[PDB]
Swiss-Prot record, chain A:
Species per Swiss-Prot/TrEMBL record: Homo sapiens (Human)
pH profile of the protein: Optimum pH is 6.5 in the presence of 1 M NaCl. Active from pH 6 to 9.
Organism phylogeny: Eukaryota, Metazoa, Chordata, Craniata, Vertebrata
Catalysed transformations (reactions): angiotensin II + H2O = angiotensin-(1-7) + L-phenylalanine; angiotensin I + H2O = angiotensin-(1-9) + L-leucine; bradykinin(1-8) + H2O = bradykinin(1-7) + L-phenylalanine; neurotensin + H2O = neurotensin-(1-12) + L-leucine
Protein name: Angiotensin-converting enzyme 2
Cofactor(s) listed in the protein's UniProt record: Zn(2+); chloride
Effect recorded for residue 371 to A: Slightly inhibits interaction with SARS-CoV spike glycoprotein
Residues of the full protein shown: 19 to 613 of 805
Length: 595, 97
């Protein structure tokens, strides 16, 4: 018996109990999310502890199989995934300290509150008040005050713990045969041992920088247009050549620019295409929406939903009888138990969210043939890319007219197309340079290039150089601004959004070549097209058994990532932006507010 | 071969561990052969003396649950084997009168 047979036997013996414990943990999490009770919390905690102990034991016992004597890629990848001990390789004291720091940062981020200066007892919380002020308010004082309060809450009282957290993560990465935590996160992008499909961590950075440099003109024109539009709404505040303030970006951190659509719409004289009123008049419900989505997914050649899905998914808010959380997320309990938890209502946003969740469930069912150690997409961005392209295909006017929501005599003009493209640019493209800058700053912090006392200075310098956001209030080195981010304070990646955006654009460029379509790219619809459905299913069923480069080339025909699909998609908007900025200043000056 | 779904018969809450299956053995089984051996499968050259490296239990439990998918529900399978040995045919089908 060779080493390969022993490794296969170990994997076959381990995957059964792995799937069993994963299903147990998923059922515990579902019972916790559907009914918040002490018993459910205790059961979920016990299941998580058992799962962590099982993972630690399996990672400790899996060290007996060498990686140099494995000729099969499917077994080698699973062995490499099992050998990674994760956070369980550190000592007890260091692990307890890291967990305490994580819990402290989570409690600080969750308990973020903004109080009035006149009344210290009168305070508010993030979601209902701060988002409403930053999104649906036109007052310069209230928004700036709320932003300054939120920036002062998370800050100097968190950096002494954040630095120790970074040090512990670097030690953990060095313990797992990595140079730093950045290389540990980029380990999923590295591919070795494949003829003509190798990939390095530096190649990813080079490709991201090249895509950013190619998008730079479009983002510059978009920023110039947003500045010219906001200059009239806020006189004597928006600089004509300087950067834009952070509190007027329509977001607490400047991530999304969708909230500025109410003030930057070019053709607001006519309402945008919305099927909410149609569903209200027709008295539809979540069941009809899910049935239409199922018919749409079946019409392209994908298998229909299982019976347990319709018999176990909570597609309707139960009310006060159950303490359910209205947070739409994909649930994959395993062994054919696919569920969806979402409080779907009669709205277009909920329609797109339900389509995204059904696309995620279809992907999970697609890569379900692979073992438990490979039950995942080719990368951390394939799921969101598939969901977004499915939502875009469903949001097409032809599909809306076919499903009976729009009248057959409905027409579309260029103004609606320009408005839709501007909305999509503010929603997706608005967060790309910020994502790039945040990821580069975090990578440089992990590399140790900025050791002690140049974090905030270089952070704001790169921010004004890339995104172009001027400081509305003088800061210093103690105010750790990146620590207030959701993904940074909770140890989550941020470049995954850029990767899924690239994958979405590449899939939109690729799949629309086979399906019959005439006109622009945003009107592409893959409904009733079995060819594109089969071409997509040939890649969705691959899972993690093959590198992401081969799976991407099997769809777009390219061995590397590309950004030209985004330019071809936004060319109708880019031309209008050039025509509007022809008589306006282009660019932004980094010299403003000499504090 | 006769098989039918038994989801409402063989399923049990918190997993029905009453059913097991053999996934590891030294060699393939001959047709019409039965073996209920519970010896630990030796996957290496080292002598097997207990649970540990290169020594895994060959029997695994299903754990049927009612919330599983259609592919994981318990299915009772009955295979009818007919013998045509040199002997009087004592078994026959029904005859209508």
């Amino acid at each position: 018996s060779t080493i390969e047979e022993q490794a296969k036997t170990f994997l076959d013996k381990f995957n059964h109990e792995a799937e069993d414990l994963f299903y147990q943990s998923s059922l515990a999490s579902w019972n916790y999310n559907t009914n918040i009770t002490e018993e459910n919390v205790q059961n979920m905690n016990n299941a998580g502890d058992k799962w962590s102990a099982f993972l630690k034991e399996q990672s400790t016992l899996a060290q007996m199989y060498p990686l140099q004597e494995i000729q099969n890629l499917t077994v080698k990848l699973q062995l490499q995934a099992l050998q990674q001990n994760g956070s369980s390789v550190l000592s007890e004291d260091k692990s307890k300290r890291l967990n305490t720091i994580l819990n402290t940062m989570s409690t600080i981020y969750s308990t973020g509150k903004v109080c009035n200066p006149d009344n210290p007892q009168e305070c508010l919380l993030l979601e209902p008040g701060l988002n409403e002020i930053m999104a649906n308010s036109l007052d310069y004082n209230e928004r700036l005050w709320a932003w300054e309060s939120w920036r002062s809450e998370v800050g100097k009282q968190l950096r002494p713990l954040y630095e120790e957290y970074v040090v512990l993560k670097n030690e953990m990465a060095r313990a797992n045969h990595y140079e730093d935590y950045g290389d540990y996160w980029r380990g999923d992008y590295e591919v070795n041992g494949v003829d003509g499909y190798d990939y390095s961590r530096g190649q990813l950075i080079e490709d991201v920088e090249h895509t950013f440099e190619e998008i730079k003109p479009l983002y510059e024109h978009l920023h110039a247009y947003v500045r010219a539009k906001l200059m009239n709404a806020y006189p004597s505040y928006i600089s004509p050549i300087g950067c834009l303030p952070a509190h007027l970006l329509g977001d607490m951190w400047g991530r999304f620019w969708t909230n500025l659509y109410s003030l930057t719409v070019p053709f607001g004289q006519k309402p945008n295409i919305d099927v909410t009123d149609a569903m209200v008049d027709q008295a539809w419900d979540a069941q009809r929406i899910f049935k239409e989505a199922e018919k749409f997914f079946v019409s392209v050649g994908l298998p229909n939903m299982t019976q347990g899905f319709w018999e176990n998914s909570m597609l309707t808010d139960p009310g006060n009888v159950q303490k359910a959380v209205c947070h739409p997320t994909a649930w994959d309990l395993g062994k054919g138990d696919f569920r969806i938890l979402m409080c779907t209502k009669v709205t277009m946003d909920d329609f797109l969210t339900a389509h995204h969740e059904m696309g995620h469930i279809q992907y999970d069912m697609a890569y379900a043939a692979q073992p438990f150690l490979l039950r995942n997409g080719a990368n951390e961005g394939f799921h969101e890319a598939v969901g977004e392209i499915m939502s875009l295909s469903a949001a097409t006017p032809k599909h809306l007219k076919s499903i009976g929501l729009l009248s057959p005599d409905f027409q579309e003009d260029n103004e609606t197309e320009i408005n839709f493209l501007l909305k999509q640019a503010l929603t997706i493209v608005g967060t790309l340079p910020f994502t790039y800058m945040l990821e580069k700053w975090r990578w440089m912090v992990f590399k140790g290039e900025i050791p002690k006392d140049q974090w905030m200075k270089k952070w704001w310098e790169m921010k004004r150089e890339i995104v172009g956001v001027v400081e509305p209030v003088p800061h210093d080195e103690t105010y750790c601004d990146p620590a207030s981010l959701f993904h940074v304070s909770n140890d989550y990646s941020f470049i995954r959004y850029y990767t899924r955006t690239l994958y979405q654009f590449q899939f939109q460029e690729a799949l629309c070549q086979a399906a019959k379509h005439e006109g622009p790219l945003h009107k592409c619809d893959i409904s009733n097209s079995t060819e594109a459905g089969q071409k997509l299913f040939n890649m969705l069923r691959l899972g993690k058994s093959e590198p992401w480069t081969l799976a991407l080339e099997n769809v777009v025909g390219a061995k590397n990532m590309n950004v030209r699909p985004l330019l071809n998609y936004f060319e109708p908007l880019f031309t209008w932006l050039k025509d509007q900025n022809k008589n306006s200043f282009v660019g932004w000056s980094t010299d403003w507010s000499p504090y | 071969v006769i098989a039918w779904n038994s989801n409402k018969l063989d399923s049990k809450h918190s997993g029905n561990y009453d059913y097991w299956y053999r996934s590891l053995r030294k060699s393939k089984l001959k047709p019409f052969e039965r073996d209920i051996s519970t010896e630990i499968y030796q996957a290496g050259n080292k002598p097997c003396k207990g649970k540990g490296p290169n020594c895994y239990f060959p029997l695994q439990s299903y754990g049927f649950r009612p919330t599983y998918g259609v592919g994981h529900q318990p299915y009772r399978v009955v295979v009818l084997s007919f013998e045509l040995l040199h002997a009087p045919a004592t078994v026959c089908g029904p005859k209508k009168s």
